[model samples]
Target: EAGSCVQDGQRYNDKDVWKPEPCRICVCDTGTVLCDDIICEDVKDCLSPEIPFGECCPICPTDLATASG
Candidate 1:
């Protein structure tokens, strides 16, 4: 039998890496999948923090600082 991992009906070979979400990554290791979350530091003093698509960290949605210029 091939040493591969099956996740969500997807097959992954050993040592293969994939991202299930913007904040999580999974690796196929010898018929098992190991997943790890992408941790982000706290965003401080922001009214709204938005995480862009395919991004790991939340960024403050403020580009208005130079909009007045």
Candidate 2:
């Protein structure tokens, strides 16, 4: 974080996806931050060219805890 430059208080890569919240998908569409409220029902639904399948899936750890409890 020391040398990294950030825009909108966040760091963005070539893909420009911001996962501030595990289940939320954020994007810099035309320099404006747009976030998705709808999460994929299944991990298999998430797809990205360079992202690994493990990283692409949006699962909230808290959701698992609540289900198990």
Candidate 3:
């Protein structure tokens, strides 16, 4: 049976851009930015968040070596 929860889910645009937030959560290394996850980093081309709070990760295939290295 299919179940549903009353939780808040994020929304994406035709260009695959997240609506509310437009930033990828990347692992950091000594303050250096690295790759991100595909699920949360699928963002390809869109307007970056005016106020960046988290790390920067490039979307696509998804890489995490540099970020966690």
Candidate 4:
């Protein structure tokens, strides 16, 4: 469309959402790329830190699931 945006030689349609970097989100709006950083909560007592695919920061493994039964 006319409002498509260009980023680093690549073009994105208007209203399209993308992540320029992990935790940072961007959207194409009228030929402009609007971006914002994702603020993740702090894990002070994380036992095991792991960075999942497409994630910006390391997270505690216990945050994903809980032990039960």
Candidate 5:
């Protein structure tokens, strides 16, 4: 049982700025990053303890940011 599992996920990362969290994980600026892009070597004990510690994927198509004073 070592292949893959697909699902909608979220990323608390920033936009426009490409970052290398070790192996590199950039923003969704070009819609290039996919579910299989993130190389999570530590694929255990995910942040969400209630979800049985599954894979961690990045979420693009984020909601448009709004302006505020």
Candidate 6:
């Protein structure tokens, strides 16, 4: 099984030493936006402090068909 999360990108924060790279990205396909497999629909949403940056969300692997079919 895969780990709970995977690092996608990095950002600097107040807690630099302990800040882990974010493991999510926003993806939009067709007209549907989803937080799939460490990816989100909006980068801002992913980076939102309210949601907390560098956190994991529910997502699953997306196929070509499902992505852009």
lDDT per residue for candidate 2 within 3-57, as digits (tens), equals: 3335657665434776665557777655456677644555344233243353544
Instruction: After superposing candidate 4 on the true structure, give the runs of residues whose Cα lies further than 4 Å from its correct spot.
Output: 63-69
Residues 1-69, model 1: lDDT tens digits: 387899999899888998999889999989999999988988477688888889898877657664342
Per-residue lDDT tens digits for candidate 4, residues 1-69, read 799999999999999999988999999999999999988778476778888999888866553368433
Q: In candidate 5, which residue ranges exceed 4 Å CA deviation?
A: 1-8, 12-21, 30-69
List clashing residue pairs in candidate 2.
none
Assess every candidate by TM-score. Answer: 0.68, 0.36, 0.19, 0.75, 0.19, 0.20
What's the TM for model 1? 0.68
lDDT of 3 by residue, 1-69 (tens): 122112145222222322223444333333333434434444445344332344344433334763442
Worst 10 residues of 1 by lDDT: 60-69
Clashing pairs in 4: none
Global CA lDDT of candidate 6, please? 0.38
Global lDDT of each candidate: 0.85, 0.53, 0.35, 0.86, 0.37, 0.38
Better of 1 and 4 by lDDT: 4
lDDT measured at residue 54 in model 2 versus the true structure, 0 to 100: 38
* Residues 3-42 of candidate 5: C-alpha lDDT, one tens digit per residue: 2222246433223344434344445433334322455354
Worst 10 contiguous positions by lDDT, candidate 2: 43-52
Runs in model 3 deviating more than 4 A are: 1-23, 37-69
lDDT of 6 at 54: 58
- Residue 26 of model 2, lDDT score: 73
Report the number of backbone clashes for model 2.
0
- Local error of candidate 3 at residue 11 (angstroms): 26
How does candidate 2 fare on TM-score? 0.36
Residue pairs with colliding backbones in model 6 are 25-39, 25-40, 26-40, 37-59
